[PDB]
Design an enzyme around this catalytic site. Structure first.
Site, PDB file in Angstrom:
ATOM      1  N   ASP A   1       0.823  -1.240  -0.078  1.00  0.00           N
ATOM      2  CA  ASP A   1      -0.016   0.182   0.135  1.00  0.00           C
ATOM      3  C   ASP A   1       1.060   1.288   0.003  1.00  0.00           C
ATOM      4  O   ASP A   1       1.556   1.480   0.991  1.00  0.00           O
ATOM      5  CB  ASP A   1      -1.052  -0.021   1.095  1.00  0.00           C
ATOM      6  CG  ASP A   1      -2.376   0.493   0.829  1.00  0.00           C
ATOM      7  OD1 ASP A   1      -2.360   1.056  -0.240  1.00  0.00           O
ATOM      8  OD2 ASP A   1      -3.219  -0.137   1.565  1.00  0.00           O
TER       9      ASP A   1
ATOM     10  N   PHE B   1     -10.890  25.047  -8.007  1.00  0.00           N
ATOM     11  CA  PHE B   1     -10.254  23.932  -8.843  1.00  0.00           C
ATOM     12  C   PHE B   1     -11.209  23.173  -9.467  1.00  0.00           C
ATOM     13  O   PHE B   1     -12.397  22.933  -9.086  1.00  0.00           O
ATOM     14  CB  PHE B   1      -9.386  23.282  -7.820  1.00  0.00           C
ATOM     15  CG  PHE B   1      -8.694  21.675  -8.361  1.00  0.00           C
ATOM     16  CD1 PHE B   1      -7.813  21.668  -8.983  1.00  0.00           C
ATOM     17  CD2 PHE B   1      -9.521  20.732  -8.001  1.00  0.00           C
ATOM     18  CE1 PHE B   1      -7.445  20.627  -9.458  1.00  0.00           C
ATOM     19  CE2 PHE B   1      -9.217  19.484  -8.543  1.00  0.00           C
ATOM     20  CZ  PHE B   1      -8.228  19.544  -9.367  1.00  0.00           C
TER      21      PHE B   1
ATOM     22  N   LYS C   1      -8.928  -5.204  -2.645  1.00  0.00           N
ATOM     23  CA  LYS C   1      -7.518  -5.343  -2.540  1.00  0.00           C
ATOM     24  C   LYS C   1      -7.384  -7.224  -2.356  1.00  0.00           C
ATOM     25  O   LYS C   1      -6.890  -7.692  -3.133  1.00  0.00           O
ATOM     26  CB  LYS C   1      -7.101  -4.620  -1.600  1.00  0.00           C
ATOM     27  CG  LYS C   1      -7.024  -3.170  -1.843  1.00  0.00           C
ATOM     28  CD  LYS C   1      -7.191  -2.036  -0.583  1.00  0.00           C
ATOM     29  CE  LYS C   1      -5.544  -2.142  -0.176  1.00  0.00           C
ATOM     30  NZ  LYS C   1      -5.486  -1.174   1.072  1.00  0.00           N
TER      31      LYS C   1
END
Ligand SMILES: CCCCCCCCCCCCCCCCCC(=O)OC[C@H](COP(=O)(O)OC[C@H](N)C(=O)O)OC(=O)CCCCCCCCCCCCCCCCC
Lengths: 1084, 330
Positions: free
Chosen positions: A394, A536, A773
């Site tokens: 990770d 943004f 995962k």
């Protein structure tokens, strides 16, 4: 959504109709987890049955249970008192105390977990409450920097709009701050302490799908009950900032919020070598069954021919001979039980338990600053460390280290340089060029380039002034001069570095309360106002802003990228190319970059576009897409200023670690939930990938694989892969009259997927879910079945830190989630280079060598009875002393095995690191397999042949010269017991290759002790008050005197011990091993 | 938590020694062995062939056998006689002793049929043995003190030998009947029940063994060799280990100065036949011979050592040449 009526307010009130878990016993508990967190394994009162049930999957333990139930029978026993109890109890009791001590910590850990001391309205008002008090569906008053009890909605807070902050770095790893909104209607109604106490409109929502993306349902409160979402909902581990106190209702609580329902499900983990041990025990079991059957047939026939045909062999029974045959077929099952001894499964325990301490006593693994031990956790999987294939990591925290440290940029195209990059401060060393004029210097960064301090304090050019003013005002941090200094209440941990650098580079930034900002030009206060906040956008990757000077001057600022501003920039820049040519210098190193600019508009288009833009500002929906157009209308003619470069300090030695582990033929994949830019940055910053690497992102792999469905890619290797969770799922394709071909449709696309993945030399997966995962982990664990190690950082990865064959958790940091769910732990990343190169292969070779010799030393001990059966009429008469058959693998030949298990090391660890090509044997199983085992068998059996048939031929002729101690039974055993005890110890002496004083001490102690007790068994000085057990007194104290009893022991030893020397020398020379090649010319 | 202590053991840096196992080290062992077996092998093989041995096969199973006449003479103790001859006389001391065959003295149901405590001379086990001699523990509720199949079946036979004179005078041979045992057993292994020298009233109730035609206490008038010390009794107690074995029966003594202990010619072996082996091929016989200052007759060790030494020597040179061929070559 199935009409829960979750009842987020009231205490119990139990309105629940016949819908609780309808089992057959009163132990029925709430459908809604109140506060219970029962992450135990069992209970402390009915532990036993569960433990023992899962304990008897050890086929050897089934076997030993059978031996006890078979031996104690007062019919045929043929052995002494049932004394297998002493070693039988150990293997089943010490493991039990072991997992008791390794599991009891959960009690205290969860107790401290379930106590928080918050304020919750259990009656009338909020009250102090430990975490284990707050039932399902209640009302919590959280405080500043709290620790979220349950995943709840939010009704009010301290801030305007009751907006709140959560630092979502618990279900993921990145630490950008995420703000949230509260309920829109009650923004004015309750918003306070009391009136909520009287409330109604209890809502229900949907049972979790572990998705974190839908959250449907509507309010049950009055005034046109309205839908439910995720922007008003909170999660478990989120930490609190700038949000002094709040108010909300609890929807999901207990130990089933979301993460307890997506992460968990421990399993009992067994190493690869164990499965082979079990198989081979099955084989030896069946072999001895056949031996006993054949021999009982022999006995029955011999009794028929000769049994009743004698007279001296008169029995008290007229039982038919076949009954004797059956009644002896269970008489070898107890003299051949030393096949599969009990000594194996005790010594294994000592081996593993010792090796763990070597794992966690390693000073070179001991971190310096943090004082962290690098301690093991399981103390049983210690040999898997030598068979790894894939490492899953990770990025969050493990590889990076949560630090940014702004490096440098350029001015008008001139770079900042590294050490001197100026005329002055050049004959001194590389030491820092002092920043002193800064009142609030306190520099957490130290630069060495100096023209950038002289031009600053002097003022040779306002280009840098423009740069730093932009770097300050174009922020989003909540600057606030609270305590003496100016506090930077950060929002996104990216601008922080540059903002602080500007702060202590004279340009300390001042308040920006509502629309008006302030800032210090070299400490001198100045004030501006914002003409338009221009935020943004992910696609835009830019955020612009305009400030007006008090006297009527306005500016612009872009704060953008290269392929986003190198299209809209000014057309009359010659310096654009010098800045660009510095930028493309910045590419050959590994830190990210942004581009900064301005546009010169003062009044001729400010108001003209401004009126239209402000009119478009208000919008029902045309605020992000049509307001964007007029928003972007003025985004041309960008008269550029320069660039900026931000690094990311990650760890130490990581490139060297990645290199070494690539040398050992390991495949390394990175799985994380962070975005794509960071993934790409790390791809180069850790040198998984460089030039000559055709990345071909998820779109490309999807298209090409769909076309092709070697290894189905344009050959050439080095094709790193970058994948979104959405595109991962898309390629995996998993969002009456039964045919069910979906799995047929799938389950090849998966196989092709995994083959592609291996044929790419690296894999990066950004924006992935904790479920995803471990999902890919055990995917690739199913296809091309391998051995997997998962190394983690925090809490999101705890789902996959517990699915792979081995789990490693980083500790010494905030880490407390993995550090309790790990299987090993330590406090760096480069330390890995020693775990799998010094400990992994050493452990593997030690265990394999031990386990391979430990079957030979038993076969070559027990088969003597089988060969002897022919000359005692198949009668189940032993060939050994009985005060020897029991002490053999206890006291005679036991220590050297253990010392070689726990001390032997192939080659010095340092050159083992220096040569990480030794490791490959572990993966390929060139030490233990289904062939070497039969070779140990076939080498023990021949030794038994020799051991028996030499003293035989010795004893068919006279041996007694003058003392007349000739052949008898009580000598034909000693003259073979001695040969047996010598041969095996000489053999272990040959196998071991790391001698110590304690090794030789142990071996010679074994031999010497056997002979010493050979004599001292023959002294009645201890046969006193022991008058019916030491029968074999005065046997060898006579037997060894003559020479002919010798000069045959030596013969047997030689004839059975030279051929192994011949084979060892031969195969060493003709086919040397890697260790040989290193060891021979090892000074060279 | 605090730092780990420092110990060369804990850090695995303890002083060591690697295998100097080399093509130079290996071969000398093979060759020094190859020349250390042949000398001993021949030196013992010569002695093996330098011992004169003779069997007799007292059994005589064929009908033509001179002793067949007493195969089933279930009337009287057959006082049978056989003639034989020896070719060259001996010197030193000589041992004469019998042997059986196909008599599974090592059988499980049999080797566990002894009662050591009662043999030792124990007061208690005397009047109450241990329940392991299953057929016969209380034949009629009396002790059977030398109790067990091992003791039950001590084979009964009396032998004697004469050398014929020049006037057909077969003179007896003076054969000794003592010392043929383990010095230990006649000292500690098992002794008579304690008390004064009577052996009669200290065996009350201890009935004779069933197949013992006579009780023990008249086995031999010699005070030592009666009771549980009759040295032949012990010799039969010490069970052999195979279906074929010799038990020491009597010794002789070398005559005074030099003359042949037993000059060549014809000899007369007169024996009472009293024991039933003719059912399980138990071809019982007697043998007799000398012993040197080296050992008995054991050719098997000599031939094995010779072969092993030669083979080790032979393989050594092949190892030499192969490592010569493969050194720094491929
Ligand atoms: C310089 C610093 C150096 C430091 C090095 C220190 C290292 C010293 C460690 C010493 C540990 C000794 C423990 C026991 C020793 C080995 C035990 C052992 O080998 O048992 C093996 C034998 C098994 O026999 P078997 O033939 O298979 O049985 C066949 C038949 N059925 C029968 O009845 O036979 O078993 C038996 O036949 C009977 C068992 C005999 C005794 C076994 C006792 C085991 C108990 C061990 C518990 C101690 C562990 C405590 C750890 C701490 C826990 C908190």
């Amino acid at each position: 959504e199935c009409t829960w009526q979750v009842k987020a307010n009231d205490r119990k009130y139990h309105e629940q109709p016949h819908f609780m878990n309808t089992k057959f016993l009163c132990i029925k508990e709430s459908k809604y987890a109140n506060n219970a967190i029962k992450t135990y394994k069992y209970n402390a009162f009915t532990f036993i049955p569960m433990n023992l049930f899962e304990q008897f999957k050890r086929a050897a333990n089934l076997y030993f249970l059978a031996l006890l139930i078979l031996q104690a029978v007062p019919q045929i026993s043929t052995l002494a008192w049932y004394t297998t109890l002493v070693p039988l109890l150990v293997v089943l009791g010490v493991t039990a105390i072991k997992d008791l001590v390794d599991d009891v910590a959960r009690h205290k850990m969860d107790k401290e977990i379930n106590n928080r001391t918050c304020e919750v309205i259990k009656d009338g008002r909020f009250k102090v409450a430990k975490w284990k008090e707050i039932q399902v569906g209640d009302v919590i008053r959280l405080k500043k920097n709290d620790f979220v009890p349950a995943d709840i909605l939010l009704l009010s807070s301290s801030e305007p709009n009751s907006l709140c902050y959560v630092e979502t770095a618990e279900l993921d790893g990145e630490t950008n701050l995420k703000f949230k909104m509260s309920l829109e209607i009650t923004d004015q109604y309750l918003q306070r302490e009391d009136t909520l106490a009287t409330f109604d409109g209890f809502i229900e929502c949907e049972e979790p799908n572990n998705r974190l993306d839908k959250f449907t349902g509507t309010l049950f409160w009055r005034n046109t009950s309205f839908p439910l979402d995720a922007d008003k909902i909170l999660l478990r581990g989120c930490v609190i900032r700038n949000t002094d106190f709040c108010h909300g209702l609890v929807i999901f609580a207990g130990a089933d919020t979301k993460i307890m329902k997506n992460s968990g499900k421990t399993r009992f983990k067994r190493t690869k070598i164990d499965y082979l041990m079990n198989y081979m025990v099955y084989t030896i079991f069946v072999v001895l069954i056949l031996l006993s059957a054949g021999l009982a047939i022999g006995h029955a026939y011999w009794e028929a021919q000769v049994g009743n045909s004698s007279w001296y062999l008169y029995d008290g029974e007229d039982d038919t001979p076949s009954y004797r045959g059956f009644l002896i077929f269970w008489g070898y099952i107890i003299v051949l039980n030393t096949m599969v001894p009990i000594s194996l499964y005790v010594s294994v325990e000592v081996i593993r338990l010792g090796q763990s301490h070597f794992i966690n006593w390693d000073l070179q693994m001991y971190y310096a600053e943090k004082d962290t031990p690098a301690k093991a956790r399981t103390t049983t999987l210690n040999e898997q460390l030598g068979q790894i294939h894939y490492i899953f990591s990770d990025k969050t925290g493990t590889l990076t280290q949560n630090i940014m440290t702004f490096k440098k940029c350029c001015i008008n195209g001139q770079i900042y340089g590294d050490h001197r990059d100026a005329s002055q401060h050049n004959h001194n060393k590389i030491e820092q060029v002092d920043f002193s004029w800064n009142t609030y210097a306190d520099g957490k960064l130290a630069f060495y380039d100096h023209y950038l301090i002289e031009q600053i304090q002097s003022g040779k050019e306002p280009e840098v002034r423009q740069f730093f003013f932009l770097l300050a005002v174009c922020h989003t941090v909540m600057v606030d001069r609270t305590d003496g200094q100016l506090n930077y209440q950060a929002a996104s941990p990216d601008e922080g570095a540059l903002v602080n650098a500007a702060r202590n580079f004279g340009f300390a930034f001042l308040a920006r309360t509502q629309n008006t900002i302030t800032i210090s030009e070299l400490g001198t206060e100045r004030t501006y106002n914002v003409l338009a906040i221009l935020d943004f956008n992910s696609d835009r990757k830019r955020m612009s802003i305009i400030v007006r000077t008090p006297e009527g001057n306005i500016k612009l600022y872009c704060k953008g990228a290269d392929t986003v501003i190198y299209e809209r920039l000014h057309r009359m820049n010659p310096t654009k190319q010098e800045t660009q040519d510095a930028l493309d210098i910045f590419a050959n190193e590994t830190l990210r970059t942004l581009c900064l600019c301005y546009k010169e508009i003062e009044e001729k288009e400010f108001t003209e576009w401004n009126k239209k833009f402000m009119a478009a500002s208000v919008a029902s929906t045309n605020r992000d897409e049509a307001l964007d157009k007029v928003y972007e209308e003025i985004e041309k003619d960008l008269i550029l200023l320069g660039a900026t470069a931000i690094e990311d300090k990650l760890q130490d030695g990581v490139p060297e670690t990645i290199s070494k582990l690539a040398k050992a033929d390991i495949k390394i994949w990175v799985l994380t939930g962070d975005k794509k830019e960071t993934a790409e940055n790390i791809g180069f910053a850790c040198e998984l990938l460089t030039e000559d690497t055709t990345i071909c992102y998820g779109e490309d792999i999807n298209s090409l694989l769909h076309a092709r469905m070697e290894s189905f890619f344009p050959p050439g290797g080095n094709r790193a892969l970058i994948i979104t969770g959405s595109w991962l799922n898309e390629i995996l394709l998993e969002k009456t009259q039964s045919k069910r071909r979906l799995e047929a449709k799938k389950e090849q696309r998966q196989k092709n997927f995994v083959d592609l993945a291996c044929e790419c030399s690296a894999v990066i997966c950004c924006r992935v879910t904790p479920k995803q995962k471990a999902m890919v982990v055990d995917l690739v664990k199913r296809y091309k079945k391998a051995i997997t190690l998962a190394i983690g950082d925090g809490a999101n990865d705890v789902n996959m830190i517990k699915t792979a064959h081995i789990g490693v958790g980083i500790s010494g940091q905030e880490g407390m989630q993995a550090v309790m769910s790990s299987d090993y732990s330590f406090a760096q990343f480069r330390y890995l280079q020693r775990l799998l190169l010094v400990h992994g292969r050493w452990s593997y070779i030690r265990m394999c060598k031990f386990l391979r010799y430990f079957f030979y030393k038993n076969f070559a001990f027990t088969l003597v009875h089988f060969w002897y059966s022919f000359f005692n009429g198949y009668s189940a008469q032993t060939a050994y002393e009985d005060w020897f058959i029991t002490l053999y693998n206890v006291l005679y030949t036991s220590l050297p095995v253990l010392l070689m298990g726990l001390l032997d090391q192939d080659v010095s660890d340092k050159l083992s690191l220096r040569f990480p090509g030794l490791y490959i044997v572990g993966q390929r199983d060139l030490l233990f397999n289904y062939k070497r085992f039969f070779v140990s068998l076939l080498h023990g059996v021949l030794t038994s042949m020799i051991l028996f048939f030499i003293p035989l031929g010795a004893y068919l002729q006279t041996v007694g010269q003058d003392g007349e101690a000739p052949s008898d039974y009580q000598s034909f055993a000693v003259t073979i017991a001695s040969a047996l005890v010598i041969t095996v110890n000489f053999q272990i002496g040959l196998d071991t290759s790391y001698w110590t004083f304690v090794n030789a001490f142990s071996i010679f102690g074994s031999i010497a002790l056997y002979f010493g007790i050979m004599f001292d068994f023959h002294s009645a000085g201890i046969h006193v008050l022991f008058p019916s057990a030491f029968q074999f007194t005065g046997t060898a104290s006579n037997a060894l005197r003559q020479p002919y009893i010798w000069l045959t022991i030596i013969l047997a030893v030689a004839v059975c011990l030279l051929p192994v020397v011949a084979i060892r020398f031969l195969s060493m020379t003709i086919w040397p091993s890697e260790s040989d090649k290193i060891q021979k010319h090892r000074k060279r | 938590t605090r730092r780990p202590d420092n110990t060369a053991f804990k850090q695995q840096r303890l002083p060591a020694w690697q295998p100097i196992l080399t093509a130079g080290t290996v071969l000398p062992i093979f060759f020094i062995i190859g020349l250390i077996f042949i000398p001993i092998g021949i030196g013992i093989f010569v002695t093996s062939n330098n011992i004169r041995e003779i069997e007799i096969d007292y059994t005589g199973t064929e009908p033509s056998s001179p002793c067949n006449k007493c195969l089933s003479p279930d009337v009287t103790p057959c006082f049978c006689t056989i003639n034989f001859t020896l070719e060259k006389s001996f010197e030193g001391n000589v041992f004469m002793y019998y042997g059986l065959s196909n008599f599974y003295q090592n059988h499980r149901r049999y080797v566990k049929s002894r009662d050591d405590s009662q043999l030792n001379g124990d007061s208690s086990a005397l009047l109450n043995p241990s329940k392991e001699c299953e057929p016969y523990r209380r034949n009629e509720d009396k002790p059977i003190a030398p109790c067990g199949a091992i003791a039950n079946s001590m084979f009964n036979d009396t032998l004697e030998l004469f050398l014929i004179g020049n006037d057909s005078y077969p003179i007896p041979i003076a054969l000794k009947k003592k010392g043929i045992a383990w010095w230990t057993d006649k000292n500690v292994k098992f002794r008579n029940p304690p008390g004064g020298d009577n052996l009669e009233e200290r065996f009350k109730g201890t009935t004779k063994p069933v197949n013992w035609l006579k009780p023990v206490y008249m086995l031999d008038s010699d005070p030592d060799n009666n009771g549980f010390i009759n040295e032949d009794f012990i010799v039969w107690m010490r069970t052999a280990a195979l279906p074929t074995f010799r038990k020491l029966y009597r010794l002789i003594e070398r005559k005074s100065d030099l003359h042949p202990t037993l000059p060549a010619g014809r000899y007369s072996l007169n024996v009472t036949y009293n024991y039933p082996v003719h059912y399980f091929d138990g071809r019982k016989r007697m043998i007799l011979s000398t012993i040197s200052w080296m050992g008995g007759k054991n050719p098997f060790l000599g031939i094995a050592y010779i072969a092993v030494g030669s083979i080790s020597f032979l393989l050594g040179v092949v190892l030499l040449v192969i490592n010569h061929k493969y050194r720094n070559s491929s």
